[PDB]
Amino acid sequence: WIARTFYDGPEKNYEKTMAILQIEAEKAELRLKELEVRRLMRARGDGPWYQYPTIDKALIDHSPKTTPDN
Amino acid sequence: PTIRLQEDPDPEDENLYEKNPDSHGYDKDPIVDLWNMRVVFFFGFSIVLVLGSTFVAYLPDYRMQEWARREAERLVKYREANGLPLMESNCFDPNKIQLPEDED
Amino acid sequence: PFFDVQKRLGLDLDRWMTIQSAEQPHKIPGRCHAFEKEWIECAHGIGGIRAEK
Amino acid sequence: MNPIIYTTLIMTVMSGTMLVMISSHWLLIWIGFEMNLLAMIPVLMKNFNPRATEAATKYFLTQATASMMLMMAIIINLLYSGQWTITKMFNPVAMTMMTMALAMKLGLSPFHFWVPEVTQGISLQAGLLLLTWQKLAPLSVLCQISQSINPNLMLTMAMLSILIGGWGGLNQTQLRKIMAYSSIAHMGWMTAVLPYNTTMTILNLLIYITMTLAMFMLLIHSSATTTLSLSHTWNKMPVITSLMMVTLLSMGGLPPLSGFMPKWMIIQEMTKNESIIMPTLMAMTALLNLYFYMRLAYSSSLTMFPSTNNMKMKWQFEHTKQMKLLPTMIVLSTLVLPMTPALSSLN
Amino acid sequence: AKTLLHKYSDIPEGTECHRKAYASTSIGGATGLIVSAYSIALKPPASFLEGVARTGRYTFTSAAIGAIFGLTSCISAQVREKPDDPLNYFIGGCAGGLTLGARTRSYGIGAAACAYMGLTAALVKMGQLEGWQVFAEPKV
Amino acid sequence: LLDLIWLETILPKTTSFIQMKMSIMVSNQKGLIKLYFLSFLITIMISMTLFNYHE
Amino acid sequence: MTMMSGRPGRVPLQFLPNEARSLPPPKLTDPRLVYMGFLGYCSGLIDNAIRRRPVVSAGLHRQLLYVTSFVFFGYYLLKRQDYMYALRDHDMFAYVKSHPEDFPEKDKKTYGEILEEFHPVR
Amino acid sequence: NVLQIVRDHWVHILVPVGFVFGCYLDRRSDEKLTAFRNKSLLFKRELRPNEEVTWK
Amino acid sequence: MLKIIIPTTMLLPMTWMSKHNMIWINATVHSLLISLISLSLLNQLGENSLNFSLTFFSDSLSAPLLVLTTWLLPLMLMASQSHLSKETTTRKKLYITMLILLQLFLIMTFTATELILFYILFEATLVPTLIIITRWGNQTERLNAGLYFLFYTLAGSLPLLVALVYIQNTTGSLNFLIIHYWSHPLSNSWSNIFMWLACIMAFMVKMPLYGLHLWLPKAHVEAPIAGSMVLAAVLLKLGGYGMMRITTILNPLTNYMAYPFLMLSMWGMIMTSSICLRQTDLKSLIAYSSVSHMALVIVAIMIQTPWSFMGATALMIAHGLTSSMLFCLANTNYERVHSRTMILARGLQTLLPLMATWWLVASLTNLALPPSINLIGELFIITASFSWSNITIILMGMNMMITALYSLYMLITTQRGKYTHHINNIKPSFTRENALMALHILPLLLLTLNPKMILGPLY
């Protein structure tokens, strides 16, 4: 009566543990991959991250400059 | 003033038995005190204690002890009948284990 | 830190004075106009880390 | 001072800060610093007395020296590369000059001696302004030039700031000096993580600003500038002293209060690089700030000090001016830790 | 500067003890000079000769602490034939601490300095061996 | 000897003594701008020499 | 160190780009929103307490405004935070895809082939 | 007459209501971890002719 | 497991919305109901834990601790209401609020799946305890005690946090399940040695370890009665629970590392038991006894065997109950005579017979009379230590003697002899105090009736 009224079967806890373990393992792998990607992006600067500003080329004036050699 | 400040004198402790000879030591209000005693005794001894002990005593076997005993009896019966050793020193089949190629 | 109000509104409060090769009066060129012009065009859009190398 | 004049001066201080924060030209940033200082000097002298005059003089001398060093750094950078944009600071000598000048402006150790004196010499409102709003501009510039920073110099100054803040605050009975030393230590904490993550710097600055605003507004609400003056407040407004104690707990860095969030995150960030020893030392040193916060809480809230007779009359009157943002500031300074991931919105 | 640090670190541990002691003395002396400069700046000595005396006292003590530390550490390392062992630096640190205690003429100062300086030097040797970084370069 | 004296002397009392001494050292300044502006000069020179020369 | 400030295509002061409209909005029953409303309620209670008014009953309109303001701000705060985390994941996955040499998927070995040292507890 | 009784003893439903709400929230949390329901190697089972899920 | 967490958060506004003369009744009744609800956690499995969600899980090690906490709350409520009679309504509600917040933090601490959440809650437990000690303590040293209680903890726990985040940068997770399944050995290097020390010393200072225990006599003597009960019953067990959790990542570095802590624990149990023999204060004796028992638990966790773990669990539960009962017993006399000197009031068996019976049962359970769970845990730990090294039976044996001495000494000093002549205000025992003693003592023997419920996951 106690097991029928207050508790479920073992398969519920078993498969819930399966789901929890899968989610946590995926999160751990994602954390490690994110750390590695951050390291590579900061070292090389060839990704969307760690892009530091440079001078805009639209500020350059491409006109004759009163002297032929600029 | 030969004193350092103005303070109340330290009051004497009140005795609950002075106003209520049967006081139960819960409150100075006799009705509130009596009902405090009643609720503590009912919900501590009658509800939590006895019913909780009864609930814990009849907790269903999720630790799987009787199941393990029956499984052990089955295994012992089969191994004794077939002449196999009761327990093996290896819990994993060596066919699935690949030891390193070289030990030198 | 840096709130790019100028870029958001297209205002140009002070960018006209940031570089030597940006529209001087009477088209007077800087002494190192071509070198700056080349460096800016090289380093444009690829980020400071890649530009430094 | 006229209310219109006071409003104009406050707006000029704020406008100088925003000019520093929105500019792309080094000259405009220096101009913003100049305008901010010029408008800030009379605010310190709003209530005239010799102490306020001395504090204003010391503040002016320090900030003028810092601004001159800032201009020198900008000029050297221009000399070695004809660049006016606030960027990676192409010269190392100019970068050392910039770091030292901005540290002097912020009150970082060892350019820290002026902060307790100036805070003690002025009123509580001017101290609030100086210890909250006057940190934004130098920190914004430091965030902008973070890539070219020399980690050794700023890490040395940050550790010195934490150590000196704790040790100096250990000895104070004046509330304004306690606030100044706490500010020095928190400045060290914010500058320690700058070479690694500017988002953590911004988060720490925001939490510190909220906590400092709540603390100063509670100190204004109960007209106390000393420990003994604050020890009378329980006999007049006990809720104020209770909220004060919880705010001091949060500023001490204890979980689950919001003051735990920055240090925690900063420590985590410093362990994403290697950097193991420095966070350990920083936490062990912040224990000193926790100690003198706890001593203040002992004096004001957890025990009852003797009072005076005339306090009875004060029981019959109420606070006329009410600060509208005090409850929200207290709540944000105490119950905000469960919303920690929201910091992703900062970057 | 870092020139003195490199001068000290270039020599192998248990070799050329006199040179290592000389470099440590220089490092100790330099530290003393900076401490005395700050002390005079913040607390004036009321007389030029008194300031010279204070500078000499501080500088001499720092130099003495560094000299004994380096000499004792190198001697222990070469006697035990065990370089890369934090114990040699522990003995050097405690010897420096006892030197400081003798300089100030205090037993408690000597004992505390021995313990703390030995622990600090052993930790420094451990960090040298394992690659611990006080000022880590940003990597991520 | 152990619980009331030496275990107290080593961990908490030594820490309190050291922190109090360092607090007295740090916060005992007369408030004269001359002295700590001289300190500022010393700091600037040391920073220019030790950190700026090593890049 | 600024990670995302220089990310191409970023509008300076937008706080919510159009791309974020492609993500599911937080539910109105999000427990984070409920916590923000709880913060607003706490602010209202403290406001009543400071001004020496009945804490639970003084101003119902003021308490309602507090709760509503906190919820209203929290909704957009959560939207922006979710957008930022989605952007981070997108950039990470794109970078991993475009640099196969840096992220090699090496051979998987069963536990029957790996030699692990055994340390007895005794 | 029950107005006074209720205004005095209405605080006695907060804890049972909290317990019921906690049970409901626990069930809601259980609802989000069904990715391996009737999928583990140990308990994988062909469904009965009428039942839809092996556990809720 | 929100079905237990939410009712406590509902205990909060019920207390703050109660009538001025009904706070104690409501708090006691609903705390008892919450304890009854939490009794359902004892139905544990044999292989894995009860994983309720991504955030909370129940193991066989944490369920008895949760039950002990939820049971202790009504006892502290009953014990506190005597000395807080003259207090105003708002301050009484604040005291009850502090107790409720402490129970909520402990409940959430004992079931957190991640180590960092466990750290945050295990540190959040500090604030209510410090407030209780420094506000509702009686004498002037309480302030100092609070400081000793605070920094002693934080100096140990701040390094741990660093270590924790470092681990998450290396393995990618702090979830206890993933940590257990993906465990890797620790090498013998200085970095690993200091990682071990950072992971261990916080829990060591919480137990506390001998030499790091100076905060405990101060904090437990200067605190009010409920503070003492919660400090001795549950808050000491946080260190043991955390150590048993964290030792899964420290192998095999543990064998080399443990030696100094083992010697400190054994010689310190001897020293603290000896200190209990010459103590003029009644509360300090109980505090030092707690230190001795916790040293035994430290040895049990450190030798790292299944029998040692079962012994540690049983001893932790038994000590919690026994120490709470002893502190309440001492507080009854203190409330009578307003002094803590042990020789001030003598011959109390003549004046208070049933109270003397309670004293006798508590002293009997302190010295581990069989078949009480105190003796079960002690004997399991002793057997494990004997397997570790046959010489330990010396030191443990000496402890088994000295303990009994001081325990009976306490009894003989307080209950036997002749009454003090000039003390003429020993009122008869109230129903509240007798009920408090009975509710302390009956669960102990009931647990003896069924011991597998407190033997931990290694059973």
Ligand SMILES: CCCCCCCCCCCCCCCCCC(=O)OC[C@H](COP(=O)([O-])OCC(O)COP(=O)([O-])OC[C@@H](COC(=O)CCCCCCCCCCCCCCCCC)OC(=O)CCCCCCCCCCCCCCCCC)OC(=O)CCCCCCCCCCCCCCCCC
């Ligand atoms: C967790 C459980 C509990 C643990 C924690 C609790 C237990 C541990 C902590 C408690 C003990 C630690 C305290 C350390 C010493 C404190 C000193 C002090 O308080 O200064 C302030 C205090 C204030 O003095 P003051 O104001 O500056 O001047 C006025 C003086 O009072 C006026 O002084 P005076 O005129 O009366 O005479 C003083 C004079 C002469 O003193 C006298 O008049 C009488 C003679 C006493 C000296 C005894 C030395 C000869 C006998 C020793 C035999 C060997 C040792 C036993 C081992 C046997 C091996 C089988 O002393 C000296 O000249 C110093 C010369 C150095 C010789 C002694 C140093 C030996 C160090 C031990 C080496 C051990 C290595 C490892 C061994 C491994 C094998 C097990 O100083 C004193 O008064 C005491 C002076 C003597 C202190 C040195 C004694 C050494 C104690 C043992 C050290 C080992 C513990 C630390 C190990 C780790 C270090 C890295």
Ligand SMILES: CCCCCCCCCCCCCCCCCC(=O)OC[C@H](COP(=O)([O-])OCC(O)COP(=O)([O-])OC[C@@H](COC(=O)CCCCCCCCCCCCCCCCC)OC(=O)CCCCCCCCCCCCCCCCC)OC(=O)CCCCCCCCCCCCCCCCC
């Ligand atoms: C983690 C899980 C969730 C928990 C979240 C955290 C805790 C809750 C949030 C915190 C904020 C909430 C309350 C803020 C305002 C409190 C201000 C105040 O004074 O309160 C007095 C006020 C009573 O004043 P009154 O009625 O006007 O008349 C009495 C006079 O005022 C007589 O007043 P008086 O001024 O004359 O008396 C002077 C007294 C007055 O001083 C105080 O009252 C101290 C209050 C300080 C507020 C806390 C600071 C800011 C928040 C930080 C919390 C930290 C939490 C983290 C853990 C660390 C613990 C510190 O000062 C003293 O006596 C000094 C004693 C020294 C003790 C030091 C300990 C103080 C710190 C304790 C903080 C504990 C947390 C707050 C608990 C609630 C307190 C009411 O209390 C209340 O009545 C309101 C509290 C309950 C309202 C909520 C109930 C909602 C309706 C019930 C139905 C529930 C719905 C369920 C939904 C489903 C439907 C069935």
Ligand SMILES: CCCCCCCCCCCCCCCCC[C@@H](O)O[C@H](CO[C@H](O)CCCCCCCCCCCCCCC)COP(=O)(O)OCC[N+](C)(C)C
């Ligand atoms: C005042 C005068 C006193 C003297 C007179 C007394 C009169 C007699 C009364 C004494 C009774 C004698 C006891 C003798 C033993 C009989 C009971 C025993 O047989 O029951 C046990 C059962 O006892 C219970 O299991 C133990 C009680 C549970 C204790 C939980 C405490 C309640 C919660 C309160 C809070 C706890 C806080 C501490 C946290 C850990 C058997 O265990 P078990 O072998 O299985 O049963 C097998 C069959 N089953 C499984 C089908 C049921």
Ligand SMILES: CCCCCCCCCCCCCCCCC[C@@H](O)O[C@H](CO[C@H](O)CCCCCCCCCCCCCCC)COP(=O)(O)OCC[N+](C)(C)C
């Ligand atoms: C202790 C609690 C701290 C709370 C701090 C105060 C909270 C109230 C302040 C309200 C903020 C108003 C901003 C909304 C108006 C729109 C402005 C928007 O356009 O700003 C954008 C950015 O939005 C804001 O930055 C987001 C502010 C959100 C602050 C909350 C985060 C706090 C961390 C978690 C604590 C819990 C919060 C609980 C809330 C009640 C601009 O982006 P960008 O120009 O490119 O970045 C400039 C800086 N860079 C370039 C260096 C990166």
Ligand SMILES: CCCCCCCC/C=C\CCCCCCCC(=O)O[C@H](COC(=O)CCCCCCC/C=C/CCCCCCCC)COP(=O)(O)OCCN
């Ligand atoms: C009231 C008493 C409480 C006080 C006790 C506090 C002491 C706790 C023990 C010290 C903890 C410090 C360690 C911090 C976390 C270490 C985590 C870690 O693993 O880092 C190591 C590095 O380890 C360290 O850096 C630790 C160095 C120690 C610095 C701080 C010293 C603190 C005091 C040390 C002596 C104290 C001894 C214990 C206390 C004794 C009781 C008084 C690996 O980093 P990597 O650089 O990547 O190495 C691999 C690649 N090279």
